[PDB]
């Protein structure tokens, strides 16, 4: 039951926020974490030949990364034409433990930073870029609103 460590540790981070900055959280967690997951992703569906460039919707790669970490699937995936889009998820693990009543909403940016801070790829929608804001209306229901680092 290895999760309990991380639930407690992120909980205590939710606890202390010193007034110097809101989110002192730098993203090296995110960077080294996706590099680790990609050590486990020693295979992803891109062709052996280098020229034919296929982009992997980081939406899908986000699904898989949740299965590697968040374990539960991203549900409602609405996307505009360009790099701006969003995920609508009914359940969020750290907000599964909080009362579902929309009363404790502030605790999100610690959540949404963790999905930012993942190095980009040159071909867009390739699966790894990250710069993300969240708008959690309902407690279990996180709303990670994506903005690519590009336009």
């Amino acid at each position: 039951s290895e999760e309990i460590l991380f639930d407690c540790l992120h909980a205590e981070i939710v606890n202390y926020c010193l007034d110097s900055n809101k989110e002192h959280d730098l993203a090296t967690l995110e960077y080294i974490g996706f590099t680790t997951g990609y050590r486990l992703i020693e295979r992803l569906t891109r062709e052996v030949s280098r020229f034919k460039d296929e982009l992997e919707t980081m939406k899908f790669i986000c699904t898989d990364f949740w299965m590697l970490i968040y374990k539960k699937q991203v549900d409602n995936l609405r996307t505009n034409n360009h790099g701006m889009y969003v995920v609508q998820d009914k359940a969020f693990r750290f907000l599964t433990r909080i009362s579902p009543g929309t009363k404790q909403l502030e605790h999100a940016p610690k959540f949404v930073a963790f999905t930012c801070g993942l190095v980009r790829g040159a071909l867009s929608n390739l699966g790894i870029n990250s710069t993300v804001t969240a708008e959690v209306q309902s407690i279990p229901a996180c709303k990670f609103h994506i903005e690519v680092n590009r336009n």
Partner: protein, 145 residues
Amino acid sequence: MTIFNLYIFDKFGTLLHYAEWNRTKKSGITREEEAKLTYGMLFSIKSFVSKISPHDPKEGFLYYKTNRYALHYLETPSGLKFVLNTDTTAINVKELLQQLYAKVWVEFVVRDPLWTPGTVVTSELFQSKLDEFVRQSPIFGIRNI
């Protein structure tokens, strides 16, 4: 005919929560003093046995009974206390309280970031999950060993 009520007390003797379902004798004492009285009583019984024990009380106190209702007790080595009221005669419930601790409390309390340690739980999910775990076996009666 579900359980009457259920009590929690820290290793410092403070009432964490009280959930009632079917208690009827309407209390002349406001619940907080009653919880204090009960915690002191249970402590007294712990001392009572730990003195008058013939040999090692490994788990010490278990529960007490009346002719017309009954009650049971659970001891958590951290010093939290579990108390509920049941009817006199049905299956034991020592195990049922162990389960409620190891699942409902360890999940819907400590794994709640917005419950600060050593206070009153006020989670609607912990409340509703307690309601449902009691509704699991709304069984009344104990005959505990």
